[PDB]
Amino acid sequence: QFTERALTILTLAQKLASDHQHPQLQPIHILAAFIETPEDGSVPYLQNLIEKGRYDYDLFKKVVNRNLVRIPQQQPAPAEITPSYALGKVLQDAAKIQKQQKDSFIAQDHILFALFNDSSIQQIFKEAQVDIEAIKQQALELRGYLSKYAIDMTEQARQGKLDPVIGREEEIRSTIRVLARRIKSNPCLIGEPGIGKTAIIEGVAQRIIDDDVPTILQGAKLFSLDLAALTAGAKYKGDFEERFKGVLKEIEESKTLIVLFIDEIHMLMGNGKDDAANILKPALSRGQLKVIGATTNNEYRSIVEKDGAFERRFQKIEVAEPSVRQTVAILRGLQPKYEIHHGVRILDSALVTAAQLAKRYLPYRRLPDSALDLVDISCAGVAVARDSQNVVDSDTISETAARLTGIPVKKLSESENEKLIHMERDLSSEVVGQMDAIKAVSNAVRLSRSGLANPRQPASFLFLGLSGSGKTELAKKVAGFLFNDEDMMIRVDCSELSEKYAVSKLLGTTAGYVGYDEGGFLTNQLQYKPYSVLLFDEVEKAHPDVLTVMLQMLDDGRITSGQGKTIDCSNCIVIMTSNLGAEFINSQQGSKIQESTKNLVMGAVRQHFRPEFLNRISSIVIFNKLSRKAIHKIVDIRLKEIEERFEQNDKHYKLNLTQEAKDFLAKYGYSDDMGARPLNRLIQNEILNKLALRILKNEIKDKETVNVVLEECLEVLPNHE
Amino acid sequence: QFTERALTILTLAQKLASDHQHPQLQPIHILAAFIETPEDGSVPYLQNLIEKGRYDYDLFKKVVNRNLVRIPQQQPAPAEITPSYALGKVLQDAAKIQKQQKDSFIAQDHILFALFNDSSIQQIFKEAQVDIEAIKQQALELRGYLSKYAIDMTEQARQGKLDPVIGREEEIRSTIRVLARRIKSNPCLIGEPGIGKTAIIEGVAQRIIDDDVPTILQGAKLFSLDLAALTAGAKYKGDFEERFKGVLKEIEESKTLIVLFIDEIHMLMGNGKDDAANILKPALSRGQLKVIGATTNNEYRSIVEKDGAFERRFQKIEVAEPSVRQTVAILRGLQPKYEIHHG
Amino acid sequence: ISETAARLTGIPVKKLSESENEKLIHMERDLSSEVVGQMDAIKAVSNAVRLSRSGLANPRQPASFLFLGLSGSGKTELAKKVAGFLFNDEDMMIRVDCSELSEKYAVSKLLGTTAGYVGYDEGGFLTNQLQYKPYSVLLFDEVEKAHPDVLTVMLQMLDDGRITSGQGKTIDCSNCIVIMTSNLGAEFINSQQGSKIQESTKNLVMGAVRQHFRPEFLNRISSIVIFNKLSRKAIHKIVDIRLKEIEERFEQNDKHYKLNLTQEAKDFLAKYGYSDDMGARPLNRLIQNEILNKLALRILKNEIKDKETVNVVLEECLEVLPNHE
Ligand SMILES: Nc1ncnc2c1ncn2[C@@H]1O[C@H](COP(=O)(O)OP(=O)(O)OP(O)(O)=S)[C@@H](O)[C@H]1O
Ligand SMILES: Nc1ncnc2c1ncn2[C@@H]1O[C@H](COP(=O)(O)OP(=O)(O)OP(O)(O)=S)[C@@H](O)[C@H]1O
Ligand SMILES: Nc1ncnc2c1ncn2[C@@H]1O[C@H](COP(=O)(O)OP(=O)(O)OP(O)(O)=S)[C@@H](O)[C@H]1O
Asked: What backbone phi and psi angles, to 5 degrees, belong to B24?
């Protein structure tokens, strides 16, 4: 109800009546409280609403002292009988004043006002008007000041607005050590955004709230300064100093250990300096004016480069991210806040896994926030879904994260079935033979899905064999099964090389040079798409400088960029290709991959491909030769897909191909030295060419047949009508 | 003294005395100043105390006009002699109110009140602005509007004027889930141009309109922000921050919640940062301030590489491209829009 | 002065902690539990940090070593492990991806954008990291493929430990540690003349080092460090370690091996994979390809719900807990 100051003045009125041996309390006794002390700082006595308003404080002093002498000496027992209606009314009026003034507590000024409004000198010896406006003016110009300049974190903390923080006790102590300096009063927190800089300032506030602060700072209070009053609050040229200088001086003395702080101190460098608030502050740094700032490391760098002065006042305080275990500790401290915020229970394992998840899948975010996001997001997820529950650790988190960050890998299937149990079948259905390539694909994904693959390495395989054997097709089909979308594959022509390639590859352009589109094909796409299948079109012909660079993705997945940042791959499957082995494939020694032969190939590949790459690669995969037996399946597969891809079914075929057509293809388009690719030449050269002509001649109205000639031919529906 | 809002009204009042070529400014010119133009945020006329007080502000304007035509002269050379003793009193009364309120400047709120104390309609059943007690009941809702700076997407959606979505419901659900968060409340739609990120934000408006959103977001008023308000409304250093702060404060309190939408985040990020206004939003972003944003993945790149601050305020959401069949579904959803569009 | 300065400037080298028993004295031991063999390499780094902490390191220069030998000999692994030991965090390693480098260099590494040129993100990757983080350890990956102009300018830090940027600012973090790597020596370790590389062979390595790098580098490096091939008993040891580390790292340990590697599983990995030119990585890949992928399937099929074992089947295979145990 009352401020401590208001209570003091009222209390003094009461106790002065006791000390002066006076019966019922009168307006006189509150006036006695007003003149209770010689201290000029006491507004009720010298730096008064009277003295700086309209009348000599002595006039009033003598009104009161005359009256105090005039009231007769009583037995101590009644010395302060009651406030009666007289002081009751003054206090009630002080409350009416609060309502008029919109003041949350009764001020000593409300007591000064209310008393003065009711009061009049009781005797002819002194006269003075109750100059209400003068006393209000003087009251308004005193004490109330920071609500116009900075947000009072400490009182708001007393009011429960503070978020307590843990695990930063040294960082908090560091700000204390700096704040405890006698000369260099200015600390600043420097680090990554999301590192916990504001959190540390609030940590200081927590230290203040629990009064765990050294005498120099023991009475401290924190206030959030800048942008509003320092920028929005400006229309005139001197507005960088009006209000700003004002508050700097308002807080230098008496009013406890006021410490302002800046959360976004980046501004305080000035756009071209020009003392845009920025210089006046350090200009006054020889004393008081204790302020703590906060900036990111790069913003720090920028304000340093753009100023050269605040840095002589401000102590650089480095803030490091916590370890995963430490992150969990803060998560635990924060856990109940989240359970409350969302009305859901959270498992300790939720917190544990959130933190390690973040380390694994959120490289662009710091652990404090990243882990918290996984928690607060999961909780929010449930809060929305709550119309139905609680948060369940990795269950909720893996799904939640995958939904936002990508990586469905962690969701686990409703049924593993086609999801890597029967996948070898499904892959063998799309492509024929080459089961080891198929197994490699499945295994790559299975290890990823199971959390077993070495996390530092993307699945990586190099595919050897004769072009036309399905090496690209495999990669595309992998994307097919990986995303249920074959166009999500990333494919780079790795053979387009000379040394002049930086940006075309993950290296990017370099900032400071023309062009700021970097590694678009790889770096930008990788940043955007957390995983894919990356196909390198004949690494056999790629320049070795690039291959050496690609190695970095191949293993130890970290990826740099000319932007000064990194990408850091993880879950992208990479596929490299070569036909070196064609020199051995053309031996035609069985459809199966032969021992020794395949080794001569891989040996030669190393000779013509840095083994350093191959010494990191998950494995080299070799394709089976497409024997006619393989063809006997492939032809149907391809004719089916080829037809299905032909726009819409306004015609298409009945396809009475039977063995006769199949064999023709196996006897005519079947080049032992070019895989199935020449069968496609046959198919288009014969089947589609005739078809196109029949369509062109409008000899087909709907459907179509394939009729073996002894070659192939088509039928006529309308007779060239 | 007076601030810009009060000065605008006062300026208009004096202008009106000259618009009517009258030697002096009268209370009627001020009442006319209160009702100048149909700009909703004008508390003196439309989003006013009058409507809240159950009065017809246009009828009142007819009253004002009936009084303005009774001005005894419109003689040119005689015009513009004095502000009048009558309004001396009113402006002095405004100063008294400032003292009553501990206010360092006279706002339109105060100048309204002061005239109202001295205003009248010579009518028993006055069609006047609601009497002073109501003036206080509603005037006290002020201090202690966004439509000036943004389009109410939710209201447009309530009025239809919206194109339905398909498939993107999942990123919408993600958006709702992010908005529902206590700390990082801001989802952002990131991806290729043309994917449907605007379509998603309209989809969000639909969910609000359709009551498919939990109460804490259900009542949200979704707005299309900045650009014009940000820069077209600018002239000088700091007035970006002023409009920003104004809006941010509005969304900070009382009106359940307001959600702001930023389509092209690149519009922010200052200029090499330099805290060139943009930063205020991140600065205050901790106070819930539910915001939805968007950006081209490459734009995201060009700003995320530089910023780092907004990243702790928003949730990155990739928006997937629909398959051909899904695309057909959108075409089907929009089919009636197209048939209507061209007949 | 040391403690308060350290809290603000890091400088752990100025602490002189009572924990030296572990904090350097047992460093070689601790590192040998992480790194198999490569005794001299372990000692080389350890020696440098001992001079740092003892105040004997000369402020004019960072610790500097060149790691030569078979890829998969643990060259970058050692470097990471000393980041681990030295700063209690392997991820603090500022690996310098030197082969990822063109003549543009500047920003992506140590110099940054010449001030006044567009892009005010300057030396973000290396210099700014030191600017922000007084010192750490840096690892120069495959310096053989670094652009020559860059190899040359980085010499300003190699000795006369200066770091002048395009920002117009200087860091001079001579307190750091740098490790350079190369596969240059692989051609001589491939002589396979015992597991430990002998004299003459090392001279050939150094011959090649001189062909690749100038005295302007080579005589500034604290030492060239040449890595050995692992002994068959040593790979036995690395196998044990890696298998344990992999499972220990395995996200949530929802599944769990008895890890009955016995002599036999370990021998199968060693015998099946120990080519003298392989590097330890293929043994690690082998177990992933031999068993772990089978495990993944067993998990997916619910053959492994919890726990797991090791079993040896001659050829190799993996047992199940077929009742979804
Ligand atoms: N040590 C900690 N104690 C308590 N809360 C923490 C801690 N670390 C992080 N947080 C959480 O992190 C969020 C605010 O993070 P901060 O690190 O202050 O953000 P910030 O990094 O200060 O913002 P910048 O980077 O200066 S814009 C809050 O929601 C806190 O719950
Ligand atoms: N589900 C949907 N997916 C895609 N587009 C849709 C969808 N529903 C409606 N549309 C319409 O298709 C267009 C999608 O455009 P936007 O979402 O603006 O594209 P964008 O992702 O915002 O990229 P910009 O910035 O508009 S080029 C809009 O003009 C919508 O009217
Ligand atoms: N002696 C060893 N002690 C511990 N780990 C080892 C050892 N040798 C190899 N490794 C493993 O090898 C992998 C890293 O191998 P390194 O030989 O450092 O790679 P690298 O050959 O240094 O890379 P380059 O060739 O310089 S790009 C790690 O996954 C280690 O587990």
From this structure: -140, 155
